[PDB]
Design an enzyme around this catalytic site. Structure first.
Site, short mmCIF file in Angstrom:
data_model
loop_
_atom_site.label_atom_id
_atom_site.label_comp_id
_atom_site.label_asym_id
_atom_site.label_seq_id
_atom_site.Cartn_x
_atom_site.Cartn_y
_atom_site.Cartn_z
N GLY A 190 0.80 -1.14 0.18
CA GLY A 190 -0.05 0.05 -0.20
C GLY A 190 1.04 1.27 -0.01
CE1 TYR A 191 5.32 0.52 0.79
CE2 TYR A 191 6.72 0.47 -1.26
CZ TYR A 191 6.45 0.30 0.20
OH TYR A 191 7.26 -0.67 0.63
CB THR B 256 6.14 9.41 -10.77
OG1 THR B 256 5.56 8.62 -11.87
CG2 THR B 256 7.66 9.75 -10.73
CB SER C 16 -1.11 -5.57 -7.01
OG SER C 16 -1.18 -4.69 -7.96
CD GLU D 5 13.65 -3.74 -0.43
OE1 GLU D 5 12.56 -3.25 0.32
OE2 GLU D 5 13.65 -3.50 -1.71
CB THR E 216 8.15 6.78 -14.54
OG1 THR E 216 7.77 6.76 -15.83
CG2 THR E 216 8.56 8.31 -14.30
CG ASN E 217 11.77 3.38 -18.10
OD1 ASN E 217 11.88 2.97 -17.14
ND2 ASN E 217 11.62 2.91 -19.15
C1 LIG Z 1 -1.43 -2.57 -12.62
C2 LIG Z 1 -0.70 -1.96 -11.42
C3 LIG Z 1 0.01 -2.56 -10.32
C4 LIG Z 1 0.67 -2.06 -9.40
C5 LIG Z 1 0.83 -0.54 -9.67
C6 LIG Z 1 0.42 0.19 -10.92
C7 LIG Z 1 -0.41 -0.53 -11.88
C8 LIG Z 1 -0.95 0.38 -12.97
N1 LIG Z 1 1.53 0.45 -8.67
C9 LIG Z 1 2.08 1.57 -8.75
C10 LIG Z 1 2.65 1.88 -10.11
O1 LIG Z 1 3.74 1.10 -9.73
C11 LIG Z 1 2.19 3.46 -10.46
O2 LIG Z 1 1.27 3.78 -11.46
C12 LIG Z 1 3.52 3.98 -10.44
O3 LIG Z 1 4.37 3.35 -9.50
C13 LIG Z 1 3.49 5.50 -11.05
O4 LIG Z 1 2.38 6.50 -10.59
P1 LIG Z 1 1.16 6.98 -11.66
O5 LIG Z 1 0.42 5.78 -12.43
O6 LIG Z 1 0.22 7.98 -11.05
O7 LIG Z 1 1.96 7.73 -13.07
P2 LIG Z 1 2.23 9.43 -12.86
O8 LIG Z 1 0.98 10.36 -12.92
O9 LIG Z 1 3.19 9.52 -11.60
O10 LIG Z 1 3.13 9.52 -14.09
C14 LIG Z 1 2.74 9.54 -15.39
C15 LIG Z 1 3.94 9.72 -16.34
O11 LIG Z 1 4.22 11.33 -16.01
C16 LIG Z 1 5.85 11.53 -16.49
N2 LIG Z 1 6.54 11.85 -15.28
C17 LIG Z 1 6.35 11.79 -13.98
N3 LIG Z 1 7.27 12.30 -13.04
C18 LIG Z 1 8.18 12.49 -14.16
C19 LIG Z 1 9.27 13.19 -13.66
N4 LIG Z 1 9.82 13.65 -12.62
N5 LIG Z 1 9.93 13.77 -14.81
C20 LIG Z 1 9.66 13.33 -16.18
N6 LIG Z 1 8.43 12.84 -16.31
C21 LIG Z 1 7.67 12.63 -15.39
C22 LIG Z 1 6.32 10.07 -16.83
O12 LIG Z 1 5.83 9.90 -18.20
C23 LIG Z 1 4.97 8.97 -16.05
O13 LIG Z 1 5.04 7.85 -16.56
C24 LIG Z 1 1.47 -0.20 -7.34
N7 LIG Z 1 1.67 0.66 -6.32
C25 LIG Z 1 1.44 0.01 -4.93
O14 LIG Z 1 1.53 0.85 -4.14
N8 LIG Z 1 1.25 -1.29 -4.86
C26 LIG Z 1 1.13 -2.08 -5.73
O15 LIG Z 1 0.83 -3.34 -5.56
C27 LIG Z 1 1.28 -1.68 -7.18
N9 LIG Z 1 0.89 -2.55 -8.22
#
Ligand SMILES: Cc1cc2c(cc1C)N(C[C@H](O)[C@H](O)[C@H](O)COP(=O)(O)OP(=O)(O)OC[C@H]1O[C@@H](n3cnc4c(N)ncnc43)[C@H](O)[C@@H]1O)c1[nH]c(=O)[nH]c(=O)c1N2
Ligand SMILES: Cc1cc2c(cc1C)N(C[C@H](O)[C@H](O)[C@H](O)COP(=O)(O)OP(=O)(O)OC[C@H]1O[C@@H](n3cnc4c(N)ncnc43)[C@H](O)[C@@H]1O)c1[nH]c(=O)[nH]c(=O)c1N2
EC number: 1.3.99.-
Lengths: 364, 386, 364, 381
Positions: B121-122, B129, B155, B240, B367-368
């Site tokens: 639960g993060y 991100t 998840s 880790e 994110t990349n």
């Molecule tokens: C199916 C599935 C399963 C899981 C998860 C997600 C999903 C879709 N996650 C969380 C997942 O890891 C999460 O989507 C990411 O950690 C990112 O957050 P957002 O989707 O809000 O994208 P967000 O809105 O943060 O970003 C969207 C995009 O914006 C751009 N961006 C953002 N910051 C940037 C920067 N600093 N510089 C440049 N570009 C930037 C990038 O293109 C980025 O990809 C999770 N979490 C959890 O707590 N427990 C879990 O079990 C899981 N498992």
């Protein structure tokens, strides 16, 4: 030199955009997801009623006689909202081929019915990997067709299919009705989740009068198929990109819009470039086909549809993050639709191969 | 200098290949990949000792190397086994490193046995991100924290006994966000005020939203010190092992497509693989996937590895997947977009399945764009861009 | 598993670096640019006198007996300063082949001489486009060679060349001296601006004892050539990239380091990734070659040298701006050297083609 | 709708192909590829009317369209004709738009005739992409400005009669700038050559207490930023011609058709070669089309499309010349002077020449920022 499309294309495109905007709401897209066959009957009925199907169809089939440029405009507008209707398969391709090549008899029954929207026709140009073409044996009264064709758009809801097959006289295209004996259609589950079928012909008998034409029919259908799917792809990617831009202006992380990070802007600009490339090459190809040789310009635009498709679909998803894959949001379907068309085109590489052959064969 | 598996590592590979082939049968996969099995599967791996393979012997583990863990990850990926990696590679070693004695004795053997399940639960709707933006709060009330908020993308919650929950303690103070003063709480999914709702994705896996309405948990459920959880949740001090992006699905898809192209004809009667274009596609996949294999081998043999190389591997590998599955799909032609369980699917629709499944990894796990910022700063000395 | 190179390799690489750093100053590089043939005699002398040539050469030729890993370390260190010496051509390839395959007679004269630095040997693997292989007619006893080879490294300053050629018995490799009758070398002007020749053999007579060996020699030379050029490329690109990073950390525009614009940082990170890919695949391939197939691993690293080469070279110039093309600065030569090696490898596509053939031919 | 040249545009294209074939004789090409030929060649084009092709009739021009200009650019590029574009497409129209009556009468017909040459003195060591940071100063002294500083990358200076000089007349940063016309005969002016690996030579210029009349200022004091950045579009879009890419493609394709690979099969019969050439073709088509759209729409084009064309075309060149160099195999790296060079070393020459364009003319990262802001509504980064 002039890049303005026709007044009729602009008027049709605008009207179709009004219609799909009203009908294809996010909720409506979710309801379509529940169907066993993704075919948007409500949309189809509104398009029929507004005159969209008959507008860019030949007068011989009851249409208003507009042509390829106007068909392209309709396809781009449909792409914007991933329209699940067989405009391309039924009107552009199947009815177009009956009008261009077929007997008055094929025109006045099947042709006219496609253009009015009473029946759905489609075409079956693709084979299963590792398999040969459909074979058409000569009988007394006609032909017996044996073989398969796959990835048939709207296959499971189509009244009839144009099917290429080998004959003793060479290649030809036959109209095969869904109810003919020896005809079986099996629904397929595809990336795009659309209505798609596999066609099995097990000694399917067809009368001589079901022969649409010879090898020229399949060539024409191949060309227009690439062009038409390129058009629909433009609409998919144009709208996808716009949605993503609007998201990047709205979604905040690190206390600012994600669109204000230069990495995001650079990638979205490259997207604009890709979509613009697709737009321009589609424009050239469509003007060339309307001329009526065009093969290479069509393959150039097809390459762009596959190439922009891959890069822009990925950008749409990545920049949206989780929202880009969450099926409660509309974003995800733009990836799926872009990818289905990418590979329906044979990929970037299939289109480049057709270009490269031409560059090899014709002296420089 | 050695760029290959040792005999013992090869034996581990053989042992796991066989083990997972008996565990992950078509029946068991069918069941896991549809809307009992998940809990039984994990309990079986626990009884067999695989969940604690990498833990110190002091905590009931086998004490094996990061390379052995990499092998295990790869063979699991080969088999499609639903190993709860975050629980065993992050939750458990965080308890080992920062937990109380009572947390260590209760949780560690029940995790190792595969009888107790966690969800992470993060993330929140406002903290993806930017995890430091999380707002779910925990307020002290006697010997309890009172928790309010919500998480997103939680998840495996339908199987979870506990949430490993990142919370903001001392919300009253308005401490600056840049201090990242959060805490980790273990929250049972039986707690009053806890609920969840499913979330579906196009990528394939289901996940959830979780909700916390005045949820009371003992202060004894806090892991590490109040406001010192950031380091726990981001592996800041390397307690880790580096999370790896396995190349095994890319190589498996390459192998299966390659074999299929060797045994399938084109229109002319030629093997499909005898086309130059096909060879070039497969070659590109090979030559690029080799990098992901090698960088991961280095990372695992290095266990700290540079954060720049960990980031490089993650960017490289998750970008590569999008490219590789494309190149392979071009080779599959009219079959490429047929999903698993469609009539006409080839190679069980594995390539189509992976091209959608890999989408979550580019923006997941940091994110990349942020990973590349790390590479630039750490490896190349570049200054901050924001 | 261990990716760290040998203590010897680390000590050699380090010593070479201190040498090229002292000799290959920006002023020295400019002086080299004025020569008719880019051969750094001062550097070559310092390498000879420091024992660099003999350290990773076989004991049979008077070397200390270190091997391929230590040769790789030297090549990478050379690459750092675009070293204009024939270490690769003369010691790694030519002397290596005489030691592995040649008679004691070839080893003790030509071999020993290359390793001492007294003579310069090279190898001529590449043909002119549109032409066939060198042909070796049996005299006997001995051979008449007719044909050409091109892009011969250090061709115009070499004492002798190993030349692959077709015989009645199949492919073989012959040692041909610059002074043998029928032997002419023409200087070529290339992107890299290095010493490069064209080799014409017009009935060049060689004695039987000049035959190094059969087809296995040419294979081994092809393999080691790819590997050694990959090593030199890693040195070129890793130093190029480091220089670019340092520039970006310090060059200011808009009152901030250009390196602080996220677009620049993303691109330089992708550069680190590419260079790291090259470093890793080179590591595997060198380890594999030291082991004795290796052929595929070596083509994998060669692909990476060409691919990283293209992208990283461009990055280096673009991020430097004008300074990246100004010949008063050292930056430009990194682009030229990267590009020369990219295409000396056959390009990314040449290397992939070798890989793809193996994937096609060997059952999966 | 017509995605092809009109008859009149076709006749212009045809006329220019022939005109440049006759101008660029082998003797002339040889001589330019090593007062002399450069000034004589430009004076000849001036006498022939080409330098003022795009200028309003009011200023002695032919008044032709942006499409006609595009055609001119392409055919000049096909011939290697050394057209002084910045003098005719920027300097002259700036004088037309913001110059005094005396500047107009003296400079315009001498530029059109090809008798008077300019260099552009914008950049400095510390002012490249951030041109507003320039520090070269101009201080009023009576009816003169006194100019002190230095410029970098001052191209074509060895033929120049005047420098078009950006100076700081006020020590915001963008608001303290003026443009001065500075004769290269002036006392206190000097230069030193700068050689590039890309191909063209350029220079550094220096200004040590250089005196020029206030009458040499173009536009208002401190309003020169507007001038030097084309803020009000008094100039046409700068275009990246695709003609060298298509030319190289054509020549390589012909060569691959007429050359044997191992076995006696034509080189072009390899699938890999066909894929390389196809990729070049398909991408160069976009550059052709976007430029046609930009030009035919000035009949303003979006700043976003101008930026898109520039990024796309300058990036494409680096990719296209690579793909063609692969096809050329062991001949790829042979330079123009070399024994064995194929196609006169044209492909090798272009792979280096195109390097200056990605960072020149507004660097690509900035151009993409513009696309993002203007076409996609993204916020300032
Ligand atoms: C199916 C599935 C399963 C899981 C998860 C997600 C999903 C879709 N996650 C969380 C997942 O890891 C999460 O989507 C990411 O950690 C990112 O957050 P957002 O989707 O809000 O994208 P967000 O809105 O943060 O970003 C969207 C995009 O914006 C751009 N961006 C953002 N910051 C940037 C920067 N600093 N510089 C440049 N570009 C930037 C990038 O293109 C980025 O990809 C999770 N979490 C959890 O707590 N427990 C879990 O079990 C899981 N498992
Ligand atoms: C051969 C030749 C000929 C000419 C010229 C140059 C050269 C090399 N020019 C100048 C040329 O156009 C100039 O180099 C550019 O206008 C850029 O300046 P810098 O070289 O200082 O690069 P600078 O140091 O500004 O930029 C280097 C790199 O940093 C990055 N960068 C910079 N700003 C950025 C930002 N905001 N966002 C993201 N990244 C950024 C980009 O990667 C960029 O390429 C010129 N000038 C002139 O006055 N008269 C002339 O005749 C010519 N002709």
């Amino acid at each position: 030199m002039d890049f303005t499309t026709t007044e009729a294309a602009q008027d049709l495109g605008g009207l179709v955009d009004t219609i799909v905007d009203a009908v294809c709401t996010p909720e409506h897209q979710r309801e379509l997801d529940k169907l066993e066959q993704r075919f948007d009957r409500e949309l189809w009925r509104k398009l029929i009623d507004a005159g969209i199907l008959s507008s860019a169809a030949p007068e011989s089939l009851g249409g208003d006689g507009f042509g390829v440029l106007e068909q392209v405009a309709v396809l781009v507008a449909l792409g914007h909202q991933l329209a699940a209707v067989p405009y391309l398969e039924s009107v552009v391709l199947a009815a177009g081929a009956l009008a261009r090549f077929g007997s008055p008899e094929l025109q006045q029954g099947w042709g006219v019915s496609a253009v009015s929207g009473d029946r759905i026709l489609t075409v079956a140009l693709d084979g299963e990997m590792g398999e040969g073409p459909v074979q058409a044996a000569g009988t007394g009264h006609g032909y017996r067709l044996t073989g398969t064709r796959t990835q048939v758009g709207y296959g499971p809801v189509a009244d009839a299919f144009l099917v290429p097959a080998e004959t003793d006289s060479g290649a030809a295209v036959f109209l095969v009705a869904a109810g003919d004996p020896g005809v079986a259609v099996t629904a397929l589950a595809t990336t795009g989740l659309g209505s798609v079928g596999h066609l099995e012909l097990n000694g399917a008998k067809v009368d001589a009068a079901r022969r649409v034409g010879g090898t020229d029919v399949a060539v024409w259908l191949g060309t227009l198929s690439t062009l038409s799917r390129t058009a629909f792809q433009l609409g998919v990617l144009e709208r996808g990109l716009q949605m993503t831009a609007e998201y990047a202006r709205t979604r905040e992380q690190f206390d600012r819009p994600i669109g204000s990070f230069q990495a995001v802007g650079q990638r979205l600009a490259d997207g604009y470039i890709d979509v613009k490339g697709l737009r321009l090459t589609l424009t050239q190809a469509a003007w060339r086909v309307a001329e009526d040789p065009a093969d290479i310009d069509v393959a150039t635009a097809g390459f762009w549809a596959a190439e922009a498709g891959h890069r822009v679909a990925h950008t749409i998803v990545h920049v949206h993050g989780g929202v880009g894959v969450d099926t409660d949001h509309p974003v995800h379907r733009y990836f799926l639709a872009a990818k289905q068309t990418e590979f329906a085109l044979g990929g970037a590489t299939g289109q480049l191969r057709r270009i490269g052959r031409e560059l090899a064969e014709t002296p420089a | 200098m050695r760029i290959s598996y040792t005999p013992q590592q090869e034996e581990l590979r053989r042992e796991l290949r066989s083990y997972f082939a008996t565990l992950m049968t078509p029946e068991r996969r069918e069941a896991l990949s549809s809307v009992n099995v998940y809990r039984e599967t994990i309990a079986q791996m626990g009884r067999d000792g695989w969940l604690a393979l990498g833990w110190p012997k002091e905590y009931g583990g086998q004490g094996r190397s990061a390379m052995d863990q990499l092998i295990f990850t790869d063979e699991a990926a080969i088999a499609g086994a639903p190993v709860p990696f975050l629980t065993i590679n992050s939750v458990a070693p965080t308890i080992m490193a920062y937990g109380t004695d009572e947390q260590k004795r209760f949780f560690l053997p029940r995790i190792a046995a595969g009888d107790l399940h966690f969800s992470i639960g993060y993330s929140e709707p406002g903290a993806g991100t930017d995890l430091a933006n999380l707002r779910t709060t925990a307020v002290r009330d006697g010997d309890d924290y009172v928790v309010n908020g919500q998480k997103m993308w939680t998840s495996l919650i339908q199987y979870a006994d506990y949430v490993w929950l990142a919370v903001r303690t001392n919300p009253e103070s308005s401490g600056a966000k840049k201090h990242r003063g959060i805490s980790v709480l273990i929250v049972p999914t039986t707690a009053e005020g806890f609920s969840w709702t499913p979330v579906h994705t196009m990528a394939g896996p289901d996940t959830s939203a979780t909700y916390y309405s005045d949820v009371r948990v003992p202060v004894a459920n806090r892991v590490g010190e109040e406001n010192a959880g950031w380091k726990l949740v981001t592996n800041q001090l390397n307690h880790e092992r580096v999370a790896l992006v396995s190349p095994a699905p890319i190589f498996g898809c390459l192998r299966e497509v390659r074999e299929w192209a060797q045994n399938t004809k084109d229109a002319g009667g030629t093997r499909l693989i005898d086309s130059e274009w096909v060879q070039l596609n497969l070659a590109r996949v090979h030559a690029k996937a080799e990098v992901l294999k090698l960088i991961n081998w280095e990372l695992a043999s290095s266990q700290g590895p540079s954060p720049a190389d960990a980031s490089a591997a993650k960017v490289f590998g998750t970008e590569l997947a999008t490219e590789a599955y494309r190149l392979l799909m071009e080779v599959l032609g009219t079959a490429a977009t047929l999903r698993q369980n469609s009539p006409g699917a080839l190679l069980r629709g594995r390539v189509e399945r992976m091209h959608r499944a890999c989408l979550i990894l580019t923006f997941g796990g940091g994110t990349n764009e942020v990973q590349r910022d790390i590479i630039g700063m750490v490896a190349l000395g570049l200054p901050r861009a924001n």
